[PDB]
Structure formats: structure tokens, C-alpha cells
Design a protein around this ligand. Structure first.
Ligand SMILES: O=C(c1ccc(O)cc1O)N1Cc2ccccc2C1
Length: 218
């Protein structure tokens, strides 16, 4: 009897600054936790900008999907909140390297301000907003599909490492799917009215459709 499928699973250490940052986020109390959703949507919007732009000179880039949008899917039953976009997606290298974005040089000073007791809200200004996910999530999975590349799954419960592997789950056309497995004490971010108010307050100037799908298995 032979395997249905095989693959390598690789485990990586986070770069030092990012590991320190994740530790600060997880072990320090902050009031303004809701900004995590702002930061993920902003990431999605940047990814959509990137594919929109490239498609200008290469329309075939959109064969994997023409619609550019952001979907929010709370699933109380699984205690997950998923953010899905149809942006440019990430290569394996992009996932490894801070999820497709360059951590800014001021990140060091940012963390020092944090250890001095600064707020977390500016985190997205330094190219590391993604990690605000861990203000509300105990585990995060990222599924991503970039043109002319395989679908990958990234995952970390923090602790200083993440894994990357080709994803053999359900296929995405193109883009990035962020699945937050929420902490017991942060399930409010599964509530559709709470999500609506957060989008309203922090994501007014996102120039793509943002659509809430409240999921309930029957
Ligand atoms: O795939 C992602 C991504 C990462 C994290 C996320 O939360 C949502 C996302 O779509 N990105 C590709 C790309 C290209 C240029 C600039 C930014 C980005 C962000």
C-alpha cells in the first residue's frame, strides 16, 4: 500500500527582530487589539494593488481571477476568523521573508518604544503589521497562491518558528488566505456586528470591496 501523496515540511526560525516582536505582542497587554483586522486588510489591499498594477502591462496575470476583493469569514464553530484576498499571492520565498513585505529599519526603535510602554497601533507603519494577528490568535495559518507557483501553507503558534509546505488542501485561484484561530478571551472578533464596526472605523480608505460572510454549518 503506497502513499496518496508526499511532501517536505520545512521548519524555519523567525528572524531575530520578528521573534522579539512576536514575544512582545503575545506577552504584553494591549487595549487596542482590534487593530489586527485593520493590519490584515491593509496587507490584503497592498497585495491587490500589486497584482492590479502588474496586470496593466500583462493582462494574462489575471487569468487566475479578475475580481480584486477581500473576504472576511468568521466561523464561531471552529473559532476561526479568516481573511481571504485575491491579491498577487506569495512565492515560498515571500512567505519565508516576512510574508512578502520588508520589515522597516525603524522596527528596532518601535520595539524599544513598546518595551518603554508604547501602544501597538503603529505596528503597521513598520512593515510588520501581520504579527498583530497574535494579539487575538493563538495560532495562525496562511494559505497562499501566486501565479506560476504552487499553493503553500505557512503556520506558526509563535514560539520562535514557523513551518512552510506545499498545500494539498482546497485550491485557491490566486491570493492569500489568513486563518486566525482565536484565543478563548477574544471571540468577540467572530461577531458580525463587531467586525462591521471595526471595518467602519479603520478601513474606510481601502479601495477594494470588503465582504463579510458569516459562516454557520447547518
Ligand atoms: O500575499 C500577501 C499577504 C501577506 C499578508 C496578508 O495578510 C495578506 C496578504 O495578501 N502579500 C503579497 C504582497 C505584495 C506586495 C506588498 C504586500 C504584499 C502582501
Amino acid at each position: 500500500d503506497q502513499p496518496m501523496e508526499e511532501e517536505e515540511v520545512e521548519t524555519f526560525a523567525f528572524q531575530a527582530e520578528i521573534a522579539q516582536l512576536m514575544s512582545l505582542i503575545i506577552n504584553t497587554f494591549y487595549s487596542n487589539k482590534e487593530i489586527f483586522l485593520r493590519e490584515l486588510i491593509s496587507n490584503s489591499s497592498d497585495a491587490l494593488d500589486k497584482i492590479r498594477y502588474e496586470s496593466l502591462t500583462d493582462p494574462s496575470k489575471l487569468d487566475s481571477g479578475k475580481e480584486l476583493h477581500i473576504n472576511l469569514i468568521p466561523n464561531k464553530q471552529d473559532r476561526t476568523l479568516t481573511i481571504v484576498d485575491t491579491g498577487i499571492g506569495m512565492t515560498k520565498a515571500d512567505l519565508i521573508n516576512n510574508l512578502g513585505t520588508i520589515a522597516k529599519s525603524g522596527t528596532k526603535a518601535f520595539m524599544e518604544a513598546l518595551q518603554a510602554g508604547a501602544d501597538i497601533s503603529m505596528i503597521g507603519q513598520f512593515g510588520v503589521g501581520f504579527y498583530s494577528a497574535y494579539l487575538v490568535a493563538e495560532k495562525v495559518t496562511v494559505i497562499t497562491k501566486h501565479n506560476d507557483d504552487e499553493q503553500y501553507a505557512w503556520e506558526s503558534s509563535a514560539g520562535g518558528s514557523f513551518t512552510v509546505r506545499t498545500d494539498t488542501g482546497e485550491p485557491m485561484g490566486r491570493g492569500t488566505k489568513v486563518i486566525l484561530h482565536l484565543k478563548e478571551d477574544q471571540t468577540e472578533y467572530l461577531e458580525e456586528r463587531r467586525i462591521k464596526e471595526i471595518v467602519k472605523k479603520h478601513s474606510q480608505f481601502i479601495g477594494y470591496p470588503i465582504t463579510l460572510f458569516v459562516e454557520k454549518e447547518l
